[PDB]
Design an enzyme around this catalytic site. Structure first.
Site: not given
Lengths: 302, 302
Positions: B41, B143, B145
């Site tokens: 993503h 932040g 991920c």
């Protein structure tokens, strides 16, 4: 989520070595061209009952010390004793030395422990220095010389070196200048700590954390003086607050709009009235091993 | 002695973390040999994340849309593919700090260490368990991920988790390093519920053995139970069934304490239908289920 979180340990892992004298082996900390370790490495098991460290050390020379980074020996070229720590000058500067500082921490302050065996890192966990100057650690035979640290920006602040497990199962050690925390000595003898107390400034930090997360039923409409609060808190086996404690709660006070002394009044009501089967941040117990800095660090990033 | 939630030392993983940016989206990647792995993503705009067609979005990207930074050094992306929910960026440089490693898919109830990272920089380390409902109870902010979970065996890092999502309830969801989610979740910006969570019974029993090893014994009783009668009560309380494999794995702790596994089960059954009566076990007011038998044996050997 709220978790006890350690600092990333890599900068410290790159500093751990093994120190052996005779058959006694423990861990040391290799920074630049010096290795720091507990002085009882110079003892046999029988020596530790009643050691005269000055006498034992005058018998040793550089060539009696085996320092190894893994299987690689680091030749010792000088040695000295500073309080309960031995310093061994070696002929190689550690290329993985981080920026660092030696600090002596206050009760209540937290730090990460890198538990090591034979110079090899085994695990990392978070500890708080208790008000009686013990830590509730997890350590087995061979763990002495493992260190505790904080990391600020890219600078490692070393604050703890491990020496001893008390009869009660808690742990005792020194700063990196070799001065014990608390009334302990590096002798193979049974030693007791003072009765412990609850770390009030950390409980307050936890209550601020609860408020930040929308859990604020315990906020009452009262305030108190610092002196009145300290005198009450001591009757519940809580530590008195210092002016430094008030100051380090400043950021959480400003973030929530709740004056430090108002939160003290709320905590005081919690103490004398109990929780009444309610919870705060999921728990019926007040947590006292999260500092204000831990709350900010875990709710805000690095 | 002592018992603490402990993570693996994180240095070997710290040397693999990088920052990955696409457009205005930034997260963390894992750089092994000449490949960087990160959540797919990162290719989404805030509008794309609502209902993304990832194959479409990806074919419209070129290598130069991806900015990978290792510290102060930009790595040049020379290829890219997608494996389920993980993006793989081929770079022109091999990571010198790549450890021995493998990718594994962890089973519910097993534990691992998480290295929480922001902007490619390690921030903290903690221990998690894969819940029976395939969530984890982590501590992750915006932040985070691309942060990974791992175990270390000898000198080999087994990567088992990459972080993608926080559910409305505050728990977390992610994938293995083949990009397959744990659990019934999808990487879309929508509110998703997990299945009802259950308690990891074999881990609770391991932790009760740890408590006995450390001198906490108030919860023991002289009763015994059969495995099936224990499982009837466990299932009533939304505890996972205990298998004979679980009984066998608890064998070493049973031998170390002299307490038969089914005797400890009788203790657990009493705790489930009576509560703790405001008492604590190893300082906890709740029954802890994120220590495996191996975690306890490793920490409490001797």
């Amino acid at each position: 989520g709220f978790r006890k979180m350690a600092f990333p340990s890599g900068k410290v892992e790159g500093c751990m070595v093994q120190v052996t004298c005779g058959t006694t082996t423990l861990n040391g900390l290799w920074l630049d061209d010096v290795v720091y370790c507990p002085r009882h490495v110079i003892c046999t098991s029988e020596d530790m009952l009643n050691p005269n460290y000055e006498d034992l050390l005058i018998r040793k020379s550089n060539h009696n010390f085996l320092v190894q980074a893994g299987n690689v020996q680091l030749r010792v070229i000088g040695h000295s004793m500073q309080n309960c720590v031995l310093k061994l000058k070696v002929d190689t500067a550690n290329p993985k030395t981080p920026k660092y500082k030696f600090v002596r921490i206050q009760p209540g302050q937290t730090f990460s422990v890198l538990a090591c065996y034979n110079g090899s890192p085994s695990g990392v966990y978070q500890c708080a220095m208790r008000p009686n100057f013990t830590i509730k650690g997890s350590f087995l035979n061979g763990s002495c010389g493992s260190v505790g640290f904080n990391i600020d920006y890219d600078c490692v602040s070393f604050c703890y070196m491990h020496h001893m497990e008390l009869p009660t199962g808690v742990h005792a050690g020194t700063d990196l200048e070799g001065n014990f925390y608390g009334p302990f000595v590096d002798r193979q003898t049974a030693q007791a700590a003072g009765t412990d107390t609850t770390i009030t400034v950390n409980v307050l930090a936890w209550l601020y954390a609860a408020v930040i997360n929308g859990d604020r039923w315990f906020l009452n409409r009262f305030t108190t003086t610092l002196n009145d609060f300290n005198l009450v808190a001591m009757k519940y086996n809580y530590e008195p607050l210092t002016q430094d404690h008030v100051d380090i709660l400043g950021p959480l006070s400003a973030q929530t709009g709740i004056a430090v002394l108002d939160m003290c009044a709320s905590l005081k009501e919690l103490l004398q009235n109990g929780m009444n089967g309610r919870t705060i941040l999921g728990s019926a117990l007040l947590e006292d091993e999260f500092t204000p800095f831990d709350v900010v660090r875990q709710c805000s990033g690095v």
